[PDB]
Amino acid sequence: FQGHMKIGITCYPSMGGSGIIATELGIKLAERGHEVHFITSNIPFRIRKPLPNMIFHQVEVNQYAVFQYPPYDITLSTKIAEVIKEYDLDLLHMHYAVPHAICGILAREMSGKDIKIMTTLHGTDITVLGYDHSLQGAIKFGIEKSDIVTSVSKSLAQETHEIIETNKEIIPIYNFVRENEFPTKHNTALKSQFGIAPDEKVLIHVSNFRQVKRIDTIIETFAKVREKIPSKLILLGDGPELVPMRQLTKELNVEEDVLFLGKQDCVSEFYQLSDLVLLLSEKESFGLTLLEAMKTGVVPIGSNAGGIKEVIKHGETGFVVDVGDCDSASDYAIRLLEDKVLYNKLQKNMLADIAERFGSELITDQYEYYYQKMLNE
Template sequence: MARKLKIGITCYPTLGGSGVVATELGKLLAEKGHEIHFITHSIPFRLGKFHKNIFFHEVEVNDYYVFRYPPYDLSLASKMAQVAKMQNLDILHVHYAVPHAVCAFLAKQMLNNGMKTVTTLHGTDITVLAQDESLKDLIRLAIHQSDAVTAVSQDLIRETRQLLDITTPIELTYNFVDKRIYYPRDVSTLRNDYAAPNEKILMHISNFRPVKRVSDVVDIFAKVQKQIPSKLLLVGEGPELTKIQCKINNLGLEDKVLFLGKQEDVAQIISLADVLLLPSEKESFGLVALEAMACGVPTIGSNAGGIPELVTHGETGFLSPIGDVDSMADNALLLLRDENLHEKFKAACIKRAQEDFCNDRITYEYESIYYKVLGLESEIEPLSADICLS
């Protein structure tokens, strides 16, 4: 039986794909008997109720008057070292290179006790921050000093190597969904609160940043609803929200669009949709598309970043060039008009999510990485062929 590990996890605990994945991973590892210590500035929002083997350590920032800006990074590094020493951690797994991997490097230097660090790149730390020349050397240092580095898509690995000119090994470890949570829900009664029986439901979920191109979502919907009775559900909040509200009003679509704000039970909400709209201009993976896929909802989106690694064009959704709202609208209409085709896509979505991106497979991959960096390869048990079918 494999030795159980003591693992520290640091992530952004608020809304965001990286925080969701890190938190869900911690919960799954705890279920397998590992001891998990979250080291963050607040309790991860997906952590929820009490979990055996999970502990939370709050990072408190020193607000000493000489500091113009509270030094969160230094406080985090100090807390990482403190928790690692007190709890005798085997691994510190950080999500995002800046600042978390840099803080882990500082903590490891303070301890000098052989603790290992694993860094997972999620996207913005590379696609945005690594574009800044003043941060490149810092990000490069964080990656070089990690004992293992993973990334959530091949496209992100490619971009990391291209932007930072590094040869450090980076292991592909896709994001995942917990199949016990993400599956098609029976929302027939709930659906009546949002749409008439003859109406289709299109959905977009994001943090409403410019990179998500929510304006394109509205344009796609405007074209679709001219030909098919439909409603658009917008889930989430962010800086573009007011601009989008104005556009919807200017187009006279206010009676066709519902703003649902932030939602925690995403699987229930996604199950309402007939299609998900994801026309992003940058998307290192596209976790929301995977969550939709697991619930049997095809994606109409762009071929940006890692989305093509997740959404199989013509099988689990349709992908178009960034900004090609005409093509995206046509693809949405194709699916919404043909019930047999939609059912075929729905079945393919569920199958792909369960087989290729299931929680059991990805948790096993992370465990294997932990054991390797600790020199415990003999602890790695063979991967069962039917691990995702149980």
């Protein structure tokens, strides 16, 4: 270890798992005593306590009458460059090849200092290219001009090499949750408040309600489970598929047993009253909602898309089914909700496995290691 580092972090602090990961990583590094600078647009964050060595820099992105589009990329690069000059930063940690790796590359030019840049891929660069190949060259450049590139799963590293066609080494470093924010415990005080009887089994799904999440499979799965087991499906979040999914609960005549609770700041309290977590996505590079529930003690059922099959060990820590397979998913779910022996076995394997592979201290050490490798090249 070469020691204390001055670190600039850029992400979208309010978008999905990537914003949580980048913020919590920054907090962990700050608690060890690194000097951590966040540089994001005018978007809020979740920071429990102020630390003298952790600063949130925020830039306002305004169109004037001069620009055709609000100049996010240039405004953010300028701000990062100003933080580099003012605080003599050692390195940048950018989340996403676009826009943020390019923003860091531009900021290094604007700052005059040859700062090192780590870029972490979360899968959004693959998503973008599924709609539109305009940014293919930018994604490739942001990957190849970063000093080190990481990915939140091995599946994502392989898919990136396929789709972007680069020989750049991509280092898989998994996601983590902060153990103190997700106590392994089970509560029922909140269960009554939301109209769930103590003898009802609770299935939970937490997402942005995009089509890629296949909440249609989740609701189809729940309807089959509901036939055999009195239960509730809790859906946390909001997004594009909200209304189609609400109508699907009426077609399957399960409307009174599906609770659309909206967006929640404190998801751990809802995991604590849950029995099963579902993530049946078509594409998923990691699936932070699974690890959050698993850390709480909730056993997972996932699809075999992307990194979900790295998070869940099929048959040991939970179950993995094919994308779209509501028959198998409801079979596994009914078993787990009937069979305390299976549930307790997977749950105890799961709590041990996530501590060995996804511990916040272990993962921070991995990131910190590659920070110093960058600085010594």
